[PDB]
Amino acid sequence: MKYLPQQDPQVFAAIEQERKRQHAKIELIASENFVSRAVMEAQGSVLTNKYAEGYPGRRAYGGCEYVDIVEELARERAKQLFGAEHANVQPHSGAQANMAVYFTVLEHGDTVLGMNLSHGGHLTHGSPVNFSGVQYNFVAYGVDPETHVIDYDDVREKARLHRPKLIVAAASAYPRIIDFAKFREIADEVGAYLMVDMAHIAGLVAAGLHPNPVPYAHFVTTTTHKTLRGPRGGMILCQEQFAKQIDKAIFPGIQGGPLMHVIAAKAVAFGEALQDDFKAYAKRVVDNAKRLASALQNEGFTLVSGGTDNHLLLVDLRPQQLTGKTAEKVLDEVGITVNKNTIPYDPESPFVTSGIRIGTAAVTTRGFGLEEMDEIAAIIGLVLKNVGSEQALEEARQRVAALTD
Amino acid sequence: MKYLPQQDPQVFAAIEQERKRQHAKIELIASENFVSRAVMEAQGSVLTNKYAEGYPGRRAYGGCEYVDIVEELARERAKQLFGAEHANVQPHSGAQANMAVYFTVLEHGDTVLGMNLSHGGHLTHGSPVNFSGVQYNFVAYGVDPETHVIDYDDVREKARLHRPKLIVAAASAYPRIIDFAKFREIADEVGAYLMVDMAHIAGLVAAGLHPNPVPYAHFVTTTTHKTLRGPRGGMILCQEQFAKQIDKAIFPGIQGGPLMHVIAAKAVAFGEALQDDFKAYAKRVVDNAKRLASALQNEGFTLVSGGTDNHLLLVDLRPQQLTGKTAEKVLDEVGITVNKNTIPYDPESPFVTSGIRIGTAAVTTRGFGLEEMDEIAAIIGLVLKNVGSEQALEEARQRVAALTD
Numbered sequence A, B: 001m002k003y004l005p006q007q008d009p010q011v012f013a014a015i016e017q018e019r020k021r022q023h024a025k026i027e028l029i030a031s032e033n034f035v036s037r038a039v040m041e042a043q044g045s046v047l048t049n050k051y052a053e054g055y056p057g058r059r060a061y062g063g064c065e066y067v068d069i070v071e072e073l074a075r076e077r078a079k080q081l082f083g084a085e086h087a088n089v090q091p092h093s094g095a096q097a098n099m100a101v102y103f104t105v106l107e108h109g110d111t112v113l114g115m116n117l118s119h120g121g122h123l124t125h126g127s128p129v130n131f132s133g134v135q136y137n138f139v140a141y142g143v144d145p146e147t148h149v150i151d152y153d154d155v156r157e158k159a160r161l162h163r164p165k166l167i168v169a170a171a172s173a174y175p176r177i178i179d180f181a182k183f184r185e186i187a188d189e190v191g192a193y194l195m196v197d198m199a200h201i202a203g204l205v206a207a208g209l210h211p212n213p214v215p216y217a218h219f220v221t222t223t224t225h226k227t228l229r230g231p232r233g234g235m236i237l238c239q240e241q242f243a244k245q246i247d248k249a250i251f252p253g254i255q256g257g258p259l260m261h262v263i264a265a266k267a268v269a270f271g272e273a274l275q276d277d278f279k280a281y282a283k284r285v286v287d288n289a290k291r292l293a294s295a296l297q298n299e300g301f302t303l304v305s306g307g308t309d310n311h312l313l314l315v316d317l318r319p320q321q322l323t324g325k326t327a328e329k330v331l332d333e334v335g336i337t338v339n340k341n342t343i344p345y346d347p348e349s350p351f352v353t354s355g356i357r358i359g360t361a362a363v364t365t366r367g368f369g370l371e372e373m374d375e376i377a378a379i380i381g382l383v384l385k386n387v388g389s390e391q392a393l394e395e396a397r398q399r400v401a402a403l404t405d
Helices: A009-024 A037-043 A065-082 A094-105 A131-135 A152-162 A180-190 A202-206 A240-254 A260-273 A276-298 A324-334 A361-365 A370-384 A390-404 B009-024 B037-043 B065-082 B094-105 B131-135 B152-162 B180-190 B202-206 B240-254 B260-273 B276-298 B324-334 B361-365 B370-384 B390-404
Strands: A086-088 A111-115 A137-141 A166-169 A193-197 A219-223 A234-238 A312-316 A355-359 B086-088 B111-115 B137-141 B166-169 B193-197 B219-223 B234-238 B312-316 B355-359
Touching (some): A009 B260, A037 A260, A065 A086, A094 A193, A094 A234, A202 A276, A234 A240, A276 A361, A324 A355, A324 A370, A324 A390, B065 B086, B065 B234, B086 B240, B094 B131, B094 B219, B094 B234, B094 B240, B152 B180, B234 B240, B324 B370, B324 B390, B370 B390
Parallel strands (some): A166 A193, B111 B137, B111 B166, B193 B219
Antiparallel strands (some): A086 A234
């Protein structure tokens, strides 16, 4: 940076602290990643200056010729990546992508069937303190109490009983492959639309490492910033038959001017995802998660569902008589970033929890491999088996530093 | 830029076209401006990598120590600028800021009283194709048919008849000072909350050039990107009594993770707005608008309300027998960017209109003064009085180029 340090020492000092923090810590929050310098430059462009309400070739205002090229690049590359008939790259966030789909097909108080929030479903999939649960009547399906895999007979029974207008599949904390074919079959039986929120797994889908929901879902929502490794924002994919309605839901429905600089950054990230090296990256993400899972089990930890098919895992801390809150706190003390997370059938509140969620997308981006996964698991074992030993925590601290340099 | 040109030639080429476009054209879209290099650098920072759901010191996840400093800088500087008891700097946009306030105080189907959309009110103030008009029962107050000033007796009568839960004041195309004291008096009479959407005028308010709604309103919403000359985004100001509810409305209510890089950029822009030179800038904006208005009248144009108190003006094109659409198109041909805009009691559709909206914020940022206002008005006269003369349009083209270099 050249201008910010002189203009705003306070903001610059804090940004620099954050930059150094991202390098020093072992980042295991499953939803996080590190974007390229190209993506950041796009976000830092003059495109922030342009009001571009509407869509390419059909904008509210003149002078959109070049931002139109940018948005079309984003849309066409998204279609290349996921094989969708239509893309909307304007949603400001995952929240707004989901909001727009709900706005398109639901009326106030309609019934929606989503994944149990304490079993892996997201806040925007029906929390009573979120617009989703306030505006619509959400009911939930669960995972099997033993396998922690989605119970598709429960999905079916809930759908048949409650007759939802919309079924939502996908999750913030589900470590296994989701069967979209079965979701669509159930949706078809009850005459419901199917929406898949692939936010967490979008990069894996792009890389052919998780089944693609696009062929099975009426609507696919996602963030651009998780496994897709793009800027912070949202996106909607859908079949051509819903394109007009979806676009109208985003604008003039729920948003105004799009963030054209972020959309440029989306295009850049989609360009990166189309490359061969992104596919290799994504395989390492999944390979690393499986290795980390196995290594954690070797340390004596129990994992939700007994492992992982994707980028993330959930440690069930009950065997160690620890809460997720306690684990999160002590790992923070040694420079490992995780989050407490409810496990299925958790006896604790979502503010305490019996689990920690871990993902490998960020550490894989930094170049960590199988050997580093082994060491991360060993450090976690050292910490969680010795929460009362300052010497153990200091050793962990040093081993974390050794990994990040 | 260093990395984007190599990584993504297509995106870079389009960005460069847009950058050159912003320099070449005379930008008179009233909602637009040019941000500083410092603001852009903040947006282009690694802060995009951080999930920071929640609020400073009360986040969902760990590691937020430094983004907390950034968000608090934004909040405290906003409070300095506007004298508000509370700030929420997380809204992704003006749309989401408004959405959050509505979510806080209204139930589905509640009555809201806003400014007539064809008289200057915004899409989010009750359009039937916007969430506002779909989710809530909007009624409208109008301006006087002769003066085009808000009819406060009409505000009062509509409020007393319809008994709205909320009254919205503020506008996207109102060229005169809004009387917030009178709005609050009317709100008090009917027991309604008052929300002021100061998006357009926020920079002028910060500079003491428009009365501050903060002392009179329960809630003040704004964008950060218009006269405030900040990054693209939203903000809510409110009294302490609503702080908890407002914060909950943004998260977990209507949004998820905030855009921490944009919030950094907000802090930077608020820092700039606190400086003496921003106050001088804002005075030039208003001085320039008044000069441009006067100069347009000298050319024989009729202005809505007969002039301006702020950054913007509306030309009533009926005397010239032109539509706003026709005017917008021909001005585009010569390199002047305006938008067609409905005038009060417009005989035309919002897709055709009898007016053009013009603002001086952007040209003032580029250093234009009174002499340039005279010339802009003269070029507009030349064009609109000679729409069928290619020689006239070519002269205009050359005079526009002379202004931008």
